[PDB]
Design a binder for this molecule. Structure first.
Ligand SMILES: *[C@@H]1O[C@H](CO)[C@@H](O)[C@H](O)[C@H]1NC(C)=O
Lengths: 638, 49, 247, 51
């Protein structure tokens, strides 16, 4: 019997482009009409038509654009009913629409301001493709108390995404954390924030950094903790002065200081050498046991005074961890479900206990032997373990076999894994495991399609259909034949600049479960790409670096970028970064915002195929009655 | 000024330099808040060391 | 000496807040743009940032470009945020030298401010000459009395002998009237027609502020703040749908 | 035109609670415009006098 199904994203946004996929399992020229009409009720939004091609095995490269409607408006959220008909049969499903029509990146020229100056800011209105779009925005400027002092409403029509606004700070004003909250006119709950200081300050003349030789702290150090002072002028020179160093402990919503560890040191040519002894730290608290300090971090507060007694630079390196083991293991990018029989690779993320990735560190298993790996720049290791074919849950921990270290400093953590619920006990799985390397644009990734079926029906899987989901959209679709006798195929995919920051590569194919009955076996795997720009924007000097710039002189700046792009410049002193380096715009911040707003949080391979697609962010529906669940919120639970 | 429910909770500040009596007219239907505060300098100069 | 020589005045904390369009034909997807900009008089490091909004690829922020601005001999005038009228204050004029092997014998001056009371006078002006060994720092303390409230100017100029190297710095500081800045709440009122008014229209009188102990020769600020109080009420979400699964 | 004496600063650095930088020591009469003193503790019961 001919078989048909729908492939749609889990969430679609207004005023954007959405793509669905259709497959026929029914060779012949058959037209399909897709109709989008609002829910609840039957009021029509859009309608598209497209004819399949037998010579192409009937892929759905069909798209639609949801109308820019206005009566969608308060109360509870809203759903949309999407319908498809290939001439003779009807399949419809409910999808969720998002008020998050795009992203607003508010960037200010500074971080800290004075009463009597001007806040200058740019709102960058992008869509979920990070592309300029024209909308209407409502902007509020809130005082530190929490009530707006100014509100505005601008339009971004034919402005290329740049909305430059300004605000004047009164000379008689309240000091503290001022806020700018901008949201799209259609979405009052899409509030984007930018907090900046208002203070009575003056520019520091140098930056002081306090850095530890060992970036962590160990309980059983017989020497102490050594921290060094690098006080350098903001133009990169060396100082001569003195400094005061104190320590403390970062407990819960409090700060305990140790006046005994109040040391004074001569900064000898931009250098210092401060040693905190173990006895002073022990006498700081009244705990008979040092092990009770595990789970709390120290902070070092330094203050450097010049030999002229002019400037006043108080710098703090808060969060120096005290840990028995200098390595911490994570399961952030590792799935919580294991594949029996199939080798279950683990994405191992071992780092310094404050998030900075480790390097050249192996991984060990309590039972497994001779198996070890190495850590690359990103901080991810690799392993392969064969799993129990039965329904026994697997709980394993990651240990370290690092040399020149004691066996009592190896971290551990119990991880809970759940077996996949195979329909009909067919023992058919899927694994899109990828070799973990440094992914760069313009390179080729040899994606592996791991397969494990039974000889009874392995030869009946003619082809595999793969889908790429990036930023919550179907980035690309494709097919690859699977002739009998092959257990592994390699797809040399040319990774382009459109795969940043990541892409969920999900794969699906039809199956018959043990008696004339339709089933779908599918799975997705989380793949991340090195986070550089989608475009290529760099800034440098058009000169030949002959000599240093001099105040009041001109330099011919060179900017390299795309064609048809609007580049905005901001020159800001690093003294504001000295006073307040918080809340600065970086591409990593943009990608983190995208990921937090991405439709997926679990790596994939849920309890069932419906769970697999819910993790992958997809909705599949067919005439057989199989359907997935729905979600109403915007961010993943917990 | 006009106060609407959608545009409420906004700091409408009117600035004055001269110390004189004021007359406000609150009309329409609903409620509201009004605060008049004079920020100045006082000759309570104590010792600052 | 310090008459035909200009000084440094433009010390902004954020500049180059500009926009630019890339319209040169592409060369393998890269467009070259040669633009002339003038670095500020400030002697520090500038973190130039660029954000590109392309209609085909997307948004992109460039890795921060640090420009280092340097001089082999300059002056930095360090001032507090604000001063108080009719008080003695002291300010720091640091002279920085980064010439590895050269002894410096420099003449330093500050021009008088009619709104300041220092030793500088229209005729009797500062004339001091100090010595800096190479690769060291100095400090000149200056005594000032603020006289009138406002944003005032501080001038410093320095010239090195036997070299054609000079510097000048202009800075702005706030002068604050003596006393404690306080906020005597003149009035707080609730505005409600047909409840406290007389048949719709209302009129409420606000008496003049007390200001009994105000410092003379100062100007005050009366702020009238208006706000709307939400009276959000009942009729929230109705009965859940679970009870309707039998009809 | 004024400058603190050197032997007095040497004596102060020899004594406790008083610290003067070594760089200040080899900073002879030619340039001693500003001085810096650090006190380990300040007596609140009485007045600590240094000349
Ligand atoms: C007056 O200012 C002080 C801070 O100096 C603040 O604590 C207080 O809340 C203010 N009161 C009013 C009525 O503005």
């Amino acid at each position: 019997s001919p078989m048909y199904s729908i492939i749609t994203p889990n969430i679609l946004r207004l005023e954007s482009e959405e793509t669905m996929v259709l497959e026929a399992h029914a060779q012949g020229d058959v037209p399909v009409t897709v109709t989008v009409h609002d829910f609840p009720g039957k009021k029509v939004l859009s309608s598209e038509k497209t004819v399949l091609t037998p010579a192409t095995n009937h892929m759905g490269n069909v798209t639609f654009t949801i109308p820019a409607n206005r009566e969608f408006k308060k109360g509870r959220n809203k759903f949309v009913t999407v319908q498809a008909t290939f001439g003779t049969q009807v399949v419809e499903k409910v999808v969720l629409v998002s008020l998050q029509s795009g992203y607003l990146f508010i960037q200010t020229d500074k971080t800290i301001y004075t009463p009597g100056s001007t806040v200058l800011y740019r709102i960058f209105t992008v869509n979920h493709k990070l592309l300029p779009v024209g909308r209407t925005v409502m902007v509020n400027i809130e005082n530190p108390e929490g009530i707006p002092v100014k509100q505005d409403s601008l339009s971004s029509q034919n402005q290329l995404g740049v909305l430059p606004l300004s605000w004047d700070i009164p000379e008689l004003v309240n000091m503290g954390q001022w806020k700018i909250r901008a949201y799209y006119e259609n979405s009052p709950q899409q509030v984007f924030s930018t907090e900046f200081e208002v203070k009575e300050y003056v520019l520091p003349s140098f930056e002081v950094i306090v850095e530890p030789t060992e970036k962590f702290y160990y309980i059983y150090n017989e020497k102490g903790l050594e921290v060094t002072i690098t006080a350098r002028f903001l133009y990169g020179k060396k100082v001569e002065g003195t400094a005061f160093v104190i320590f403390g402990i970062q407990d819960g919503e409090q700060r305990i200081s140790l006046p005994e560890s109040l040391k004074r040191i001569p900064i000898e040519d931009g250098s210092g050498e401060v040693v905190l002894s173990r006895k002073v730290l022990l006498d700081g608290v009244q705990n008979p046991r040092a092990e009770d300090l595990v789970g709390k971090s120290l902070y070092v507060s330094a203050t450097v005074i010049l030999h002229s007694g002019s400037d006043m630079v108080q710098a703090e390196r808060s969060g120096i961890p005290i840990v028995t083991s200098p390595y911490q293991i994570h399961f952030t990018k590792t799935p919580k479900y294991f594949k029996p029989g199939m080798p279950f690779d683990l994405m191992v993320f071992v780092t310094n206990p404050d998030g900075s990735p480790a390097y050249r560190v192996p991984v060990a298993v309590q039972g497994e032997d001779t198996v070890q790996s190495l850590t690359q720049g990103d901080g991810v290791a690799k392993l392969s373990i064969n799993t129990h074919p039965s329904q026994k849950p697997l709980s394993i921990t990651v240990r370290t076999k690092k040399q020149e270290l004691s066996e009592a400093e190896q971290a551990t953590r119990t991880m809970q894994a759940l077996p996949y619920s195979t329909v009909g006990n067919s023992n058919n799985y899927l694994h899109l495991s990828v070799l973990r390397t440094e992914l760069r644009p313009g390179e080729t990734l040899n994606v592996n399609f791991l397969l494990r079926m039974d000889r009874a029906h392995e030869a009946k899987i003619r082809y595999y259909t793969y889908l790429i989901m990036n930023k919550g959209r179907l980035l690309k679709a494709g097919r690859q034949v699977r002739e009998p006798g092959q257990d592994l195929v390699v797809l040399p995919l040319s990774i382009t600049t459109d795969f940043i920051p990541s892409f969920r590569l999900v794969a699906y194919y039809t199956l018959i479960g043990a008696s004339g009955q339709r089933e779908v076996v599918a799975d997705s795997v989380w793949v991340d790409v090195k986070d550089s720009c989608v475009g290529s924007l760099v800034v440098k000097s058009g000169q030949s670096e002959d000599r240093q710039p001099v105040p009041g002189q001109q330099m011919t700046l060179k900017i390299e970028g795309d064609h048809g792009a609007r580049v905005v410049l901001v020159a800001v002193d690093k003294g504001v970064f000295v006073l307040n380096k918080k809340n600065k715009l970086t591409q990593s911040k943009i990608w983190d915002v995208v990921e937090k707003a991405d439709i997926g949080c679990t790596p994939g391979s849920g309890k069932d195929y419906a769970g697999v697609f819910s993790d992958a962010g997809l909705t599949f529906t067919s005439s057989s009655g199989q359907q997935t669940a729905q979600r109403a919120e915007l961010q993943c639970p917990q | 000024h006009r106060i609407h429910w959608e545009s409420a909770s906004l700091l409408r500040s009117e600035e004055t330099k001269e110390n004189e009596g004021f007359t406000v007219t609150a009309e329409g239907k609903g409620q509201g808040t009004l605060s008049v505060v004079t920020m100045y300098h006082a000759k309570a100069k104590d010792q600052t060391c | 000496a310090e008459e035909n020589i200009v000084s440094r005045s433009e010390f902004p904390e954020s500049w180059l807040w500009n926009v630019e369009d890339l319209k040169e034909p592409p060369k393998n997807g890269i467009s070259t743009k040669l633009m002339n900009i003038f670095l500020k008089d400030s002697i520090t490091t500038w973190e130039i940032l660029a954000v590109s909004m392309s209609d085909k690829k997307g948004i992109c922020v460039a890795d921060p470009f640090e420009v280092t601005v340097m001089q082999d001999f300059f002056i930095d005038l360090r001032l507090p945020y604000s001063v108080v009228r009719n008080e003695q204050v002291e300010i720091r004029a640091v002279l920085y030298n980064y010439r590895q092997n050269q002894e410096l014998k420099v003449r330093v001056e500050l021009l008088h401010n009619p709104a300041f009371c220092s030793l500088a006078t229209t005729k009797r002006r500062h004339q001091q000459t100090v010595t800096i060994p190479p690769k060291s720092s100095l400090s000149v303390p200056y005594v000032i009395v603020p006289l009138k409230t406002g944003l005032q100017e501080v001038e410093v100029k320095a010239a090195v002998y036997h070299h054609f190297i000079s510097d000048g710095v202009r800075k702005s500081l706030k002068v604050v009237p003596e006393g404690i800045r306080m906020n005597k709440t003149v009035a707080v009122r609730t505005l409600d027609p047909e409840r406290l008014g007389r048949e719709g229209v209302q009129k409420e009188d606000i008496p003049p502020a007390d200001l009994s102990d105000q410092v003379p020769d100062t100007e005050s600020e009366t702020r009238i703040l208006l706000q709307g109080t939400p009276v959000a009420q009942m009729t929230e979400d109705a009965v859940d749908a679970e009870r309707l699964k039998h009809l | 035109g004024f400058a603190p004496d050197t032997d007095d600063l040497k004596q102060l650095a020899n004594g406790v609670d008083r610290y003067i930088s070594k760089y200040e020591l080899d900073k002879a009469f030619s340039d001693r415009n500003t001085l810096i003193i650090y006190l380990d503790k300040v007596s609140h019961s009485e007045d600590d006098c240094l000349a």
